[PDB]
Amino acid sequence: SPWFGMDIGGTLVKLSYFEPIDITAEEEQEEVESLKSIRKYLTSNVAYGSTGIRDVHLELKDLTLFGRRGNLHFIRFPTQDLPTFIQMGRDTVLCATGGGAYKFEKDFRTIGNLHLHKLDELDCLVKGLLYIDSVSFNGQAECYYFANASEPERCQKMPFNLDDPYPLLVVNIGSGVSILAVHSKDNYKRVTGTSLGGGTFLGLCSLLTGCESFEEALEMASKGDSTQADKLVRDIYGGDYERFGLPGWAVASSFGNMIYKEKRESVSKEDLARATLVTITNNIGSVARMCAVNEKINRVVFVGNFLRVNTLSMKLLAYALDYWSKGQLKALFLEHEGYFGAVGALLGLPNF
Amino acid sequence: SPWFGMDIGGTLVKLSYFEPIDITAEEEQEEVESLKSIRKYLTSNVAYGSTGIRDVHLELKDLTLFGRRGNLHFIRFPTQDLPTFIQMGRDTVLCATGGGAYKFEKDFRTIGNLHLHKLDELDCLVKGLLYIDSVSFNGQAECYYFANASEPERCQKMPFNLDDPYPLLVVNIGSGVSILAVHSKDNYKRVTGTSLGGGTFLGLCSLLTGCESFEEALEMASKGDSTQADKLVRDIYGGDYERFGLPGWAVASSFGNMIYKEKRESVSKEDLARATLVTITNNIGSVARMCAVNEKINRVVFVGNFLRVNTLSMKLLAYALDYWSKGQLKALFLEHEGYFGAVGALLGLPNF
Ligand SMILES: Nc1ncnc2c1ncn2[C@@H]1O[C@H](COP(=O)(O)OP(=O)(O)NP(=O)(O)O)[C@@H](O)[C@H]1O
Ligand SMILES: Nc1ncnc2c1ncn2[C@@H]1O[C@H](COP(=O)(O)OP(=O)(O)NP(=O)(O)O)[C@@H](O)[C@H]1O
Ligand SMILES: CC(C)c1ccc(CC(=O)N2CCN(c3ccc(C#N)nn3)CC2)cc1
Ligand SMILES: CC(C)c1ccc(CC(=O)N2CCN(c3ccc(C#N)nn3)CC2)cc1
Ligand SMILES: [Mg+2]
Ligand SMILES: [Mg+2]
Structure with a gap:
């Protein structure tokens, strides 16, 4: 099966995809057409549909993962469009995290024989952060x-x-x-x-x-210019609030100048x-x-x-x-x- | 002179006024007409001009202050209207705090012989809080x-x-x-x-x-109903986020449902x-x-x-x-x- 990880957030779905680059001649024969079709689709396009994007600049090239060499790809699309993603998938072991791993669990199971494994969103954040820093960004x-x-x-x-x-x-x-x-x-x-x-x-x-x-x-x-909307320390004191080390440029009240109608009309x-x-x-x-x-x-x-x-x-x-x-x-x-x-x-x- | 304290904030001016109630017959003779005029104006009205208000329910009655008995009154008006207050005053020792004690220092000094003493806004907060709790709210x-x-x-x-x-x-x-x-x-x-x-x-x-x-x-x-605008934990997870004890009703993203145009149109x-x-x-x-x-x-x-x-x-x-x-x-x-x-x-x- 293809190697994916998915984080289904409240706004965006993030997908990491491992593209093997050490495929042997025998392995190429043994792979089914749909598997080749997915790999070709993901690696030959940088926009998917109308709202999916591959962040090509983030690709990790020639990474060794699970004993294989490949490229790690980074793809995102709005959670609002997950129904389109699942419909594409219906016409694999998926490790999924974020709240949507739970919210959309029943939807992923409409994909036949697909095995969904839900993982904790903050556990995955910590493990992924430590892993990427450990392998470096292509040497940087x-x-x-x-x-x-x-x-x-x-x-x-x-x-x-x-x-x-x-x-x-x-x-x-x-x-x-x-x-x-x-x-x-x-x-x-x-x-x-x-x-x-x-x-x-x-x-x-x-x-x-x-x-x-x-x-x-x-x-x-x-x-x-945010100071057209915000009320600054200098707007209240005429300057710094010296006793507590607050500079006149500090925001005292966010949007606080919008209590005046004339200022709302000019902002x-x-x-x-x-x-x-x-x-x-x-x-x-x-x-x-x-x-x-x-x-x-x-x-x-x-x-x-x-x-x-x-x-x-x-x-x-x-x-x-x-x-x-x-x-x-x-x-x-x-x-x-x-x-x-x-x-x-x-x-x-x-x-x- | 009348006994006032003033806190000139970024939005509201707060004024505390001590009304003596132990005035002797000789003291009444010796007081000048303008002083009697101020006391009468403050105690016979609950609205001052178009924007000043006396919070009568907060009055402390028969308080002993500086060796005299009197009533402590609480008055507020918008800082935007301080020019009107100062103009009334032009046509006393004033202890003043808040940022406006500094911002409007030169304006208070247009009142002849008036002596302004600027005090720190948080020092005055602490001292006033401890004092009012110590004397009680008329026994409550x-x-x-x-x-x-x-x-x-x-x-x-x-x-x-x-x-x-x-x-x-x-x-x-x-x-x-x-x-x-x-x-x-x-x-x-x-x-x-x-x-x-x-x-x-x-x-x-x-x-x-x-x-x-x-x-x-x-x-x-x-x-x-704030949940029409806010994105809740249950909107992201479908329920509670159990692992970290976050209930489904907790707000995950304030105004976060306003990223959807159809929701902005119905809120x-x-x-x-x-x-x-x-x-x-x-x-x-x-x-x-x-x-x-x-x-x-x-x-x-x-x-x-x-x-x-x-x-x-x-x-x-x-x-x-x-x-x-x-x-x-x-x-x-x-x-x-x-x-x-x-x-x-x-x-x-x-x-x-
Ligand atoms: N193309 C984009 N579309 C929508 N939001 C974007 C986009 N790019 C950046 N953002 C911002 O990124 C935020 C989402 O960040 P992200 O880390 O993907 O959260 P999430 O995982 O979807 N939400 P959560 O369930 O709270 O973890 C949005 O709230 C925006 O502020
Ligand atoms: N009649 C009112 N007019 C304006 N704001 C009011 C009124 N009543 C209550 N408020 C609220 O009270 C707030 C001001 O509180 P207040 O404690 O008087 O602040 P301040 O001293 O003027 N500002 P600061 O300089 O930051 O200490 C406003 O921001 C409003 O949210
Ligand atoms: C006394 C009254 C008028 C008053 C009230 C309120 C404030 C605002 C305030 O006190 N502050 C300090 C903390 N601020 C930040 C900001 C960024 C970071 C980072 N990273 N950390 N702190 C924000 C502004 C100023 C003055
Ligand atoms: C995991 C993702 C989806 C997520 C991110 C963000 C949140 C919001 C959050 O974590 N919280 C806890 C702290 N909250 C308050 C509120 C009031 C007081 C008082 N008094 N104290 N804390 C506010 C909501 C939930 C979920
Ligand atoms: Mg997230
Ligand atoms: Mg104040």
Whole structure:
């Protein structure tokens, strides 16, 4: 059977697919046409249907997995379109994680003789993250940080070594946010979560601006000025609040200038998109900072697809975590984005 | 001079006024007409201009303060209307706190010979809170909690004794949120803050629903169903997420169902108002819970005018803090709402 792992989230399905590249002449004869058909379809297309995408830049080439050499592919599509995926599949051992492994269990079993094995979404996240960092990103670091994040003329992406990754705070920003404290390969806990996540960004943006996609919302946000919507410390104090070290530029009240009708009438959609992004991102950073301090952990890695093609939020997290922690915490990022759960699911295949 | 304390916040001005009730016949002769005019104006009206309000139900009667007996009055008006207040005053030693004590310092000095003394907004909050609880609310408890907050048929407001109030986590929900850890009458720290506060509720509500007042936003929220806008755990899992004890009714993604155009087209303004209230309130409770755990404090008192005439948010905080802390934290509330800073400022008068 083809080797897949699937993470069915509240918004996106992520699929990891292992393409063998050590197929012998005898193995090629022995493989059935449908199996060859799937491999050809997945590797000869980068768009699947109208909403599936293969992230070619993330491919791991010539990986040794389960004693075979192959390429590891990364594919995503909206959970809303899973019925189309299952219908394609009806006309294999599937290790699946995320909430949708449970929600859509009965739907996967409409595919005859298909064997579904449900795995925990945070177990798979941890296992996939540790695995990808261990094998490297085609010889490059999987993990990076922003050096000198407080200085724009100096701020730059730099590789970061996670050879001894423990302990580690993992902040998974999907539809909602889960925060994990990882103490060893087999010892972690879900410290807490927040419901102000990527779905809040996308949902509020859609209501406030009429944007029709995540990418459109980020484009609007890149053009906006969040201080047109937010009430800053300097708007309340006339300057810094010196006694407690709060700079005048800090946000005192997100969207707090929208209590004035004249300001609501002048604010732009781009301003509102940027205020939504800044509000969500700062809240995630602040919750992460509080969790890191309580867990006595100084490395905080942010994952999940809220941050895909989202350098604005990544740089805001890098700057804010450094600033508000007085340099005691470091924001870390991973090239593989939102795919760790899907990889972790695939890694569960030998247990079945 | 009249005895005032003033807290000029980012949204509301709060004024505490001590009305002497032990005036002798000689003192009545010796008082100048303008002084009598102010006392008469303040005590014979409950609405001042078009936007000032005296909260008569909060009056402390027959209080002994600075060696005199009198009534303590509580008055509020929008900071936007402070220019009208100052103009009335131009045509006294003023202890003032909040950011506006600094922002509008030069404006107060347009009142001739008026002496402004700026005091710290969180110092005044702590001093005012401890003072009002110490003198009682006309013989009743100033502090209350919701007993059996997990059970609607049992949930009821009950008095709570703060005779030995330390340690105490104080969560001040104004335009933005400050969180204080109070260890003694003279030992406290601002643990952190959040910018998702009362101004976020009012500002987002205004954008999403067109409401024109705080009271209108709460009325809309009382009629709405936040689950029409929020994505719940059961929407992602089909039920509970059992492994980490997350109930299916928990919000996974605030506003997360608004990523679907058809759902944006069916949601009501009342639903959006309630989702805004639930999102802000749960985030405040969660940040408070994390701070209480790190500070090793089990009593959390919520103050600030986000909670005035807002039983919905108070009951949500009572329930959520109890539920998510597994009964280890208790939510406490104070009858005096948003007035503690103004009282603390008034208490600074003897130092000048
Ligand atoms: N093409 C996209 N479509 C929709 N959302 C996107 C897209 N790209 C990035 N995002 C963002 O990524 C988020 C989803 O991240 P993801 O890590 O895939 O969550 P999920 O696994 O589907 N949800 P969860 O069940 O909470 O783990 C969205 O909320 C968006 O903010
Ligand atoms: N009549 C009202 N008008 C405006 N806001 C109100 C009113 N009643 C209650 N509120 C709420 O109370 C909040 C303000 O609380 P308050 O404690 O007075 O803050 P503040 O001191 O003005 N701001 P800050 O500078 O951050 O301390 C608003 O953000 C609203 O959510
Ligand atoms: C005194 C009143 C007017 C007031 C209330 C409220 C605030 C907001 C506040 O106190 N803060 C501190 C914590 N903030 C962050 C942000 C990012 C990270 C990361 N990563 N960490 N913390 C956010 C702003 C300021 C002022
Ligand atoms: C696994 C994915 C799908 C997921 C992500 C995110 C969440 C949200 C979450 O994890 N939580 C726990 C903490 N919550 C509160 C709330 C109030 C208080 C008070 N007072 N404290 N905590 C809020 C919801 C659930 C599920
Ligand atoms: Mg996920
Ligand atoms: Mg205030």
